[PDB]
Amino acid sequence: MEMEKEFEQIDKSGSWAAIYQDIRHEASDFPSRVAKLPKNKNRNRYRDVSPFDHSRIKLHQEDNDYINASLIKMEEAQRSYILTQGPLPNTVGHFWEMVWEQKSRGVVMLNRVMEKGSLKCAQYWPQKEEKEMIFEDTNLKLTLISEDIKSYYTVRQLELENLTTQETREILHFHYTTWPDFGVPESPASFLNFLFKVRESGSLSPEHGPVVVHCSAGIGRSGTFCLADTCLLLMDKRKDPSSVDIKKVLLEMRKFRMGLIQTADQLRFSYLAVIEGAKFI
Numbered sequence: 001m002e003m004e005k006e007f008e009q010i011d012k013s014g015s016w017a018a019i020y021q022d023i024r025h026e027a028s029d030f031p032s033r034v035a036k037l038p039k040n041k042n043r044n045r046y047r048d049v050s051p052f053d054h055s056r057i058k059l060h061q062e063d064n065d066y067i068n069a070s071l072i073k074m075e076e077a078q079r080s081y082i083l084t085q086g087p088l089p090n091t092v093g094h095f096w097e098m099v100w101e102q103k104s105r106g107v108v109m110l111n112r113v114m115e116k117g118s119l120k121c122a123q124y125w126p127q128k129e130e131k132e133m134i135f136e137d138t139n140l141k142l143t144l145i146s147e148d149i150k151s152y153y154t155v156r157q158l159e160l161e162n163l164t165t166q167e168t169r170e171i172l173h174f175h176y177t178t179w180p181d182f183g184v185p186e187s188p189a190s191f192l193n194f195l196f197k198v199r200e201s202g203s204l205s206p207e208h209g210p211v212v213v214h215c216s217a218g219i220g221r222s223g224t225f226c227l228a229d230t231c232l233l234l235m236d237k238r239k240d241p242s243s244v245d246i247k248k249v250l251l252e253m254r255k256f257r258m259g260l261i262q263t264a265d266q267l268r269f270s271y272l273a274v275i276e277g278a279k280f281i
């Protein structure tokens with residue numbers, strides 16, 4: 001069923017809350033035993049948001065390999081994403097270790113450091129060229145190279161250095177700065193513009209490790225970003241773009257991380273973004 005018609009049918013009937021609960025009811029349930037170990041309690045931002053054991057990212061160290069991060073592997077679309085939480089004061093070194101080990105080119109950030117008067121994630125990148133950051137626990141150095149500030153997003157060039165080998169890599173930081181404190185954006189136009197800027201960079205392409213995507217919990221806004229991207233790629237691989245079922249794509253993605261899309265308003269916004277983006281695809 002053409003999703004644009006399914007959309008008007010749900011909207012006219014006001015059944016967004018009913019569709020969303022059906023998804024929550026059918027979603028996969030897999031163990032997260034490593035996330036709930038007592039040694040990991042200070043590695044988790046939210047008690048109710050954990051990575052499944054089968055899909056979790058492992059840090060390459062014998063001490064403790066745990067980070068709140070999942071590999072979402074979309075087989076038909078041929079795209080992979082790492083979804084993670086906003087880093088904590090004691091996990092900023094783990095975060096950059098993961099970026100290094102997984103060979104990521106891009107980091108996508110969909111939140112502000114402060115929202116609703118509370119801290120949603122650590123200040124995990126340098127704000128001035130001449131004041132670099134050193135992570136002593138993971139032996140990494142991070143330098144701000146340049147910054148391009150626009151109306152809806154900021155793009156930063158960073159240099160990450162493995163102090164152990166003196167190898168360096170260029171990381172691009174794509175920071176969407178205008179998602180509102182409550183609700184979802186009114187138009188998907190600036191979110192779609194942002195997504196196509198990330199694509200243009202090469203960050204989502206198979207010659208690199210998976211893109212790292214985060215918000216505060218790494219399931220709501222982060223879920224919207226990967227669902228829209230995968231749906232638009234599929235609408236292009238299929239003889240009948242109309243065969244793309246956004247609810248079936250979301251349940252597939254929920255096999256890899258729990259809770260993707262946190263509200264009925266985020267589900268509706270995801271439909272809007274894909275409907276509007278398809279008009280350019």
Ligand SMILES: Nc1nnc(-c2ccc(O)cc2)s1
Binds near residue numbers: 235236241281
């Ligand atoms: N009426 C139409 N159905 N499909 C179209 C299409 C699909 C993929 C593209 O890359 C460009 C155009 S137009």
